[PDB]
Amino acid sequence: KIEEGKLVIWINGDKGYNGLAEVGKKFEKDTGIKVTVEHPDKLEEKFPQVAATGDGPDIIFWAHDRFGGYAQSGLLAEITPDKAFQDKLYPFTWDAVRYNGKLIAYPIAVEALSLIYNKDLLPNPPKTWEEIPALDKELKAKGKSALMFNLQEPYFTWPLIAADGGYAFKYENGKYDIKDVGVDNAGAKAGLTFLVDLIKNKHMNADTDYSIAEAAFNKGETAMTINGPRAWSNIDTSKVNYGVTVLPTFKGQPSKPFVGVLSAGINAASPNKELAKEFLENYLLTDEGLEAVNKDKPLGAVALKSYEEELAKDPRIAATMENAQKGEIMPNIPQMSAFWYAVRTAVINAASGRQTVDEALKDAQTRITK
Numbered sequence: 001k002i003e004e005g006k007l008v009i010w011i012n013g014d015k016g017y018n019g020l021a022e023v024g025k026k027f028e029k030d031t032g033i034k035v036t037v038e039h040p041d042k043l044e045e046k047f048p049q050v051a052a053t054g055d056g057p058d059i060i061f062w063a064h065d066r067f068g069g070y071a072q073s074g075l076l077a078e079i080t081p082d083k084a085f086q087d088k089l090y091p092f093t094w095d096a097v098r099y100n101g102k103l104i105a106y107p108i109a110v111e112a113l114s115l116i117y118n119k120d121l122l123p124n125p126p127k128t129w130e131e132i133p134a135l136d137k138e139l140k141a142k143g144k145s146a147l148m149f150n151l152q153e154p155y156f157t158w159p160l161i162a163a164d165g166g167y168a169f170k171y172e173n174g175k176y177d178i179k180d181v182g183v184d185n186a187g188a189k190a191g192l193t194f195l196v197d198l199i200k201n202k203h204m205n206a207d208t209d210y211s212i213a214e215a216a217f218n219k220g221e222t223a224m225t226i227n228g229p230r231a232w233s234n235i236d237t238s239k240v241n242y243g244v245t246v247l248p249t250f251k252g253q254p255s256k257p258f259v260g261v262l263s264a265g266i267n268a269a270s271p272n273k274e275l276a277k278e279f280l281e282n283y284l285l286t287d288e289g290l291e292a293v294n295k296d297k298p299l300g301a302v303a304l305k306s307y308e309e310e311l312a313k314d315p316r317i318a319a320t321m322e323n324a325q326k327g328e329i330m331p332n333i334p335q336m337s338a339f340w341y342a343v344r345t346a347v348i349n350a351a352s353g354r355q356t357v358d359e360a361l362k363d364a365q366t367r368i369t370k
């Protein structure tokens with residue numbers, strides 16, 4: 001069981017967890033309530049396992065796409081902030097955490113992937129994905145490469161797959177059709193074929209992950225990378241002269257990144273629900289609270305209107321929002337977990353050459369509509 005009179009918080013290890021730990025220390029000085037911040041590996045998978053038994057953290061942080069599945073299993077408490085508190089966050093961020101008409105989380109920040117480039121290697125970023133093979137050929141002649149990014153997580157390849165027609169679930173009439181899936185369609189095959197051809201032609205390696213791409217870019221070995229807000233702090237330290245901009249178009253269509261709203265849910269088994277609420281509304285969801293996390297690892301565009309006005313001046317945040325406006329808020333429906341696992345498998349098999357693109361996407365389509 002969860003201990004009473006204390007707060008345990010789980011947040012991903014790529015977030016500003018030290019910063020969040022500081023907001024917890026502030027809460028503890030004022031109220032006497034100890035706050036413990038942890039970042040278990042695979043917490044988005046572990047949470048449903050432990051929460052099912054009345055264990056786990058009092059508060060869990062993740063993008064909103066996972067939350068409909070948790071709420072469906074009865075693992076999240078319904079939150080009911082008063083209208084006054086609600087008016088402080090952007091309306092659309094509240095929409096991302098509404099499930100079956102109920103609020104199941106507090107929206108924290110908005111994030112989308114962007115194109116990041118080394119201005120010393122590339123004064124101007126490519127406008128199309130199609131010109132990258134040629135950029136790479138010339139950069140290779142100088143000992144560098146054009147682009148390196150995480151190919152192990154479908155989140156990073158999805159903008160290209162969706163660019164010319166790929167989609168997860170058909171949204172229509174204020175509802176998602178869990179039977180109308182678009183991973184096996186023409187647009188999706190075109191996008192993933194482009195990706196697989198980059199690897200075949202030696203422009204990228206199928207095994208590239210987050211650390212391999214980060215190391216290469218921050219070292220000045222590659223002219224471009226694709227990443228989210230959290231990557232910015234480490235690039236700042238690298239002293240690389242970088243720019244953050246809009247992703248390239250594919251077949252003349254803009255890349256469409258999935259947009260995630262970092263959110264905070266309260267475990268339905270938690271005996272400390274009123275403490276969690278006090279912490280979230282009066283300590284974390286304040287200019288001071290968000291600034292502390294943001295300083296540890298950039299949150300992106302925050303849900304709190306008052307603090308977002310100040311961050312909006314940052315060109316990196318502008319680029320982030322521009323990429324978001326071209327993408328799509330991820331669905332929060334329970335089927336999202338099956339979508340993500342099926343698309344991860346498809347991308348890795350196709351990229352590693354274990355299956356062809358058609359075989360890979362066909363299996364995913366089948367799995368998701370099961």
Ligand SMILES: OC[C@H]1O[C@H](O[C@H]2[C@H](O)[C@@H](O)[C@@H](O)O[C@@H]2CO)[C@H](O)[C@@H](O)[C@@H]1O
Pocket residue numbers: 012014044063065066153154155156228260340
């Ligand atoms: O790649 C599948 C994965 O994508 C998203 O996870 C993101 C997350 O939203 C970001 O905050 C950051 O942590 O990077 C993750 C990708 O490594 C989905 O939110 C997640 O459910 C999904 O499995």
